[PDB]
Design a protein around this ligand. Structure first.
Ligand SMILES: Nc1ncnc2c1ncn2[C@@H]1O[C@H](COP(=O)(O)OP(=O)(O)O)[C@@H](O)[C@H]1O
Ligand SMILES: Nc1ncnc2c1ncn2[C@@H]1O[C@H](COP(=O)(O)OP(=O)(O)O)[C@@H](O)[C@H]1O
Ligand SMILES: O=c1ccn([C@@H]2O[C@H](COP(=O)(O)OP(=O)(O)O)[C@@H](O)[C@H]2O)c(=O)[nH]1
Ligand SMILES: O=c1ccn([C@@H]2O[C@H](COP(=O)(O)OP(=O)(O)O)[C@@H](O)[C@H]2O)c(=O)[nH]1
Lengths: 228, 228
């Protein structure tokens, strides 16, 4: 939908970020010149920050442009959502308004399954899917640590980390490794002062120019204007 | 919808079982002569079996007919579903067929909220709702024990306990107490040999005569035909 995965050997693969965007279960589509580049660069920056804080990620290197070199993993069929501020689907699960500051972070597990439209699950469903409690607990422990690091880092830069989605896999040592991407596609980012979205919500709800929003994020994080 | 609650003092209340049935989020409605009586009697039998196995319930006594006398509790806004065999909404959450035997029981938490149509939640949502992890763990521990007792008891009688819903509240000692009802309205019961529903699914999917189905359950459990 927004990324290509190209095998290299029985060891690593290429993650290519595309300019395509989709929302509302693939029903809304557009293309954004340079979105691939931005998401790639921002993933790189985030993976490197996390690695420095002792988070095992799949990031190996950059292969020029929109391509990252990443470790091949046996992927868990999960999307792991961490939420700090009420937004999106959480409003349908808790009678709390958009912008409501949660007393502590919420972690939600979604089963990656297109036929079922990625339904929420709990630890018991996970076990039936072959994911032990020990594994789930390790997964949530990492997500919550990732949350702390990202939110602290973004707060210093005037960005509120509202919520975000992670994915994980297992390496050949049986270690749990952070995978996929971390980008304005997979996080909610709000300007600390104005509360305005600097993320995919801009595309989702026609809140303005997506590229402009993603550029702003890139500039606020790196300190420089995007080269492309 | 199917029950009346009438206060007595600051201590106990009357639970009245009505002949009304509703399904599909209240959209389907009918009335069944004697359904109140059956559900009341079956709740009584189930609460008494559970009490004997050391499960704290709200059951105090019978007030003649369709009325039970029950302890007043500070109710948790939860519906606690335990599942042994795949049926109902679980088919939309896991790609497994109706009748699939789960490797271990699944416990699901639903937030009792009409405005939101009782959405599934996890332990984190529960905490935001004011339910501690300790409380949730105690709740699930009871549900799972209730499951064992009910399924063992029903298995001896040629009935498979497919799934069921429980509700809980807190007593004045801060103890977690099983509440609401246990009946063919709130459980799936399948005949062990034929796999046929002897529960509300008969009304839900026009599988035959609901009263006949509930009578069969009552006769198979008590050993005698229902008096009314
Ligand atoms: N390190 C990795 N090893 C193996 N597969 C991965 C890795 N990182 C991401 N993937 C997978 O590559 C696929 C490409 O992702 P995509 O179809 O764009 O959707 P999404 O990644 O958002 O689920 C996904 O199924 C994702 O789980
Ligand atoms: N021991 C109890 N103390 C206080 N309230 C109770 C007790 N048992 C059940 N209730 C509540 O009484 C109400 C009547 O139930 P009803 O409207 O028929 O729907 P349901 O019980 O299926 O949620 C419910 O909100 C239920 O939680
Ligand atoms: O398939 C998905 C669903 C959600 N998210 C992200 O996870 C967070 C939580 O999203 P939510 O549950 O609110 O769903 P949404 O409203 O985004 O559809 C948001 O930052 C989304 O951008 C994602 O990256 N991929
Ligand atoms: O509001 C509800 C929803 C479910 N159940 C019971 O809980 C079990 C699980 O139901 P499920 O999640 O499959 O929903 P359903 O298919 O019954 O709507 C079944 O025994 C239902 O009878 C209930 O008593 N009240």
């Amino acid at each position: 939908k927004a990324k290509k995965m190209i095998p290299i050997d029985d060891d690593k693969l290429i993650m290519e970020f595309k300019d395509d965007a989709t929302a509302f279960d693939g029903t809304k589509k557009a293309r954004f010149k340079g979105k691939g580049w931005l998401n790639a660069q921002l993933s790189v920056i985030f993976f490197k920050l996390l690695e420095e804080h002792g988070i095992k990620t799949h990031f190996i290197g950059v292969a020029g442009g929109n391509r990252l070199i990443v470790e091949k993993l046996d992927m868990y069929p999960l999307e792991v959502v961490v939420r700090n501020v009420v937004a999106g689907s959480l409003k349908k699960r808790l009678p709390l308004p958009e912008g409501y500051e949660l007393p502590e972070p919420i972690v939600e597990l979604y089963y990656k399954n297109d036929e079922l439209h990625d339904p929420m699950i709990n630890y018991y469903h996970a076990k039936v899917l072959g994911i032990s409690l020990d594994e789930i607990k390790k997964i949530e422990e990492i997500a919550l640590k990732v949350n702390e690091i990202l939110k602290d880092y973004l707060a210093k830069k005037g960005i509120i980390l509202v919520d975000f989605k992670l994915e994980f896999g297992k390496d050949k040592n049986g270690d749990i490794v952070l995978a996929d991407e971390i980008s304005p596609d997979t996080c909610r980012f709000w300007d600390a002062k104005t509360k305005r979205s600097l993320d995919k919500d801009v595309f989702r709800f026609d809140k303005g120019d997506l590229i402009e929003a993603y550029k702003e994020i890139y500039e606020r994080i790196t300190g420089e204007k995007p080269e492309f």
